[PDB]
Amino acid sequence: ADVSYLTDQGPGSGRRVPARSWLHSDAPALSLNGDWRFRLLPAAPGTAGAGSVLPSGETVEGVAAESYDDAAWDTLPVPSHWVMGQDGKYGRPIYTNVQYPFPIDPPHVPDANPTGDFRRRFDVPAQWFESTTAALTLRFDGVESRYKVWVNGQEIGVGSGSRLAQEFDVSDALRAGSNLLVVRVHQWSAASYLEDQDQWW
Amino acid sequence: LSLPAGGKPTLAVANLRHTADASDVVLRWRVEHDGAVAASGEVAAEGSDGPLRAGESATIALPAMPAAPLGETWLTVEAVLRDATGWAPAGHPLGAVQLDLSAPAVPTRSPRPATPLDGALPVSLGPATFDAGTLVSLAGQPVSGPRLELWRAPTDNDRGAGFGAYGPGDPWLNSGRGVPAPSSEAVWKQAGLDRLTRRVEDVAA
Ligand SMILES: [Cl-]
Ligand code: NA
Numbered sequence: 001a002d003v004s005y006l007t008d009q010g011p012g013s014g015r016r017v018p019a020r021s022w023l024h025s026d027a028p029a030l031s032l033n034g035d036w037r038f039r040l041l042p043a044a045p046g047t048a049g050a051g052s053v054l055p056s057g058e059t060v061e062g063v064a065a066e067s068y069d070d071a072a073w074d075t076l077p078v079p080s081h082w083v084m085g086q087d088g089k090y091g092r093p094i095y096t097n098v099q100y101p102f103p104i105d106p107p108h109v110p111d112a113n114p115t116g117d118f119r120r121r122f123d124v125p126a127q128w129f130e131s132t133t134a135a136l137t138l139r140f141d142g143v144e145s146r147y148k149v150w151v152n153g154q155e156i157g158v159g160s161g162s163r164l165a166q167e168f169d170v171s172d173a174l175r176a177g178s179n180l181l182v183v184r185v186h187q188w189s190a191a192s193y194l195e196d197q198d199q200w201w
Numbered sequence: 202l203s204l205p206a207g208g209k210p211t212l213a214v215a216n217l218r219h220t221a222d223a224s225d226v227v228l229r230w231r232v233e234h235d236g237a238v239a240a241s242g243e244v245a246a247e248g249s250d251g252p253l254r255a256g257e258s259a260t261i262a263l264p265a266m267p268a269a270p271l272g273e274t275w276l277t278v279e280a281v282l283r284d285a286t287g288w289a290p291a292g293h294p295l296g297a298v299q300l301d302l303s304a305p306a307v308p309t310r311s312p313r314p315a316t317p318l319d320g321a322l323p324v325s326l327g328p329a330t331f332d333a334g335t336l337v338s339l340a341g342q343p344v345s346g347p348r349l350e351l352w353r354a355p356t357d358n359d360r361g362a363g364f365g366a367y368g369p370g371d372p373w374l375n376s377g378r379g380v381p382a383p384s385s386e387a388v389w390k391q392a393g394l395d396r397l398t399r400r401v402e403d404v405a406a
Contacts, residue, residue: 051322052333052403111399
């Protein structure tokens with residue numbers, strides 16, 4: 001399983017939609033915001049230093065599958081930061097001004113890399129698949145830092161740019177009725193080198 | 202101590218005292234093969250006219266001591282008090298010297314450097330057990346490591362900054378006062394030597 005996306009120095013990958021304005025449109029839309037199933041892993045699965053981070057039997061990217069046992073997972077509000085509002089259950093904010101909190105060894109990041117897996121079931125109206133609709137777009141307005149996205153088990157792409165919006169074309173992955181969105185979010189990635197603002201991580 | 206070519210071990214002795222001769226001292230020797238005593242004896246600290254006098258030196262040939270053919274052979278000589286005083290017991294040591302007499306070493310033959318393989322990592326090797334390439338036990342007990350360390354708990358000297366440091370210049374210059382500099386501890390902490398992080402680049406069978 002290829003996890004070079006974590007250290008890649010490119011703009012992101014997959015079914016990317018060309019950049020456009022954030023507009024007030026009357027197009028049909030829905031918010032995926034709410035309480036999502038969540039777990040925090042101490043390391044990025046599939047990396048050389050994370051050989052036993054996942055539960056027995058789970059494959060590196062098996063979290064994407066529609067056939068997945070997440071029964072025991074906690075829930076986390078989205079939007080939120082996992083290091084805020086949880087009494088430290090998932091770690092705490094880290095404040096640096098100039099210094100990076102990891103070695104300056106671009107584009108490599110530490111083995112201790114809090115990685116959040118998010119699983120969200122949602123419904124999409126049957127009418128969105130009629131010919132009056134040309135395409136279906138999934139939009140993330142902000143994720144810190146890099147993340148990979150799967151819809152109904154299909155890899156959709158990888159996003160970077162923590163405070164920048166990113167749209168993906170999910171026309172071919174969605175179906176009428178019940179759907180699964182899975183997002184894996186890493187605290188540290190190659191993008192962290194571009195994001196050394198004087199603020200809390 | 203020295204071993205003159207084809208000769209036997211030679212002990213140089215100097216009585217560096219202000220007044221007393223060496224009649225109160227006995228020179229004890231032992232030869233050990235990998236730490237186990239093989240032979241041992243005593244000689245007296247004698248000069249050209251009785252006990253070695255304050256300011257006098259002598260050289261004495263010790264018995265032949267052929268090297269063990271395998272392992273290491275070490276000679277130890279110690280000057281010890283013959284008799285108790287009010288402040289020390291009979292046989293109290295004053296100082297000691299060693300000489301390596303070992304036969305030419307047979308360095309053990311290390312395994313050839315090997316090319317990494319594809320596929321599964323071993324889960325155990327000899328007394329070691331691994332969980333995805335991470336050590337978890339040795340000889341029946343939980344163990345972690347090895348982990349590189351460059352830090353040591355700074356000594357009081359490591360924390361000093363009065364004299365200068367000797368690194369940046371010939372130490373014989375500037376009356377041997379060094380070049381003004383922070384403490385070792387200060388530079389170690391500034392370099393982050395106390396907080397090294399370990400990143401795994403790759404693991405392979
Ligand atoms: Cl570490
Ligand atoms: Na910063």
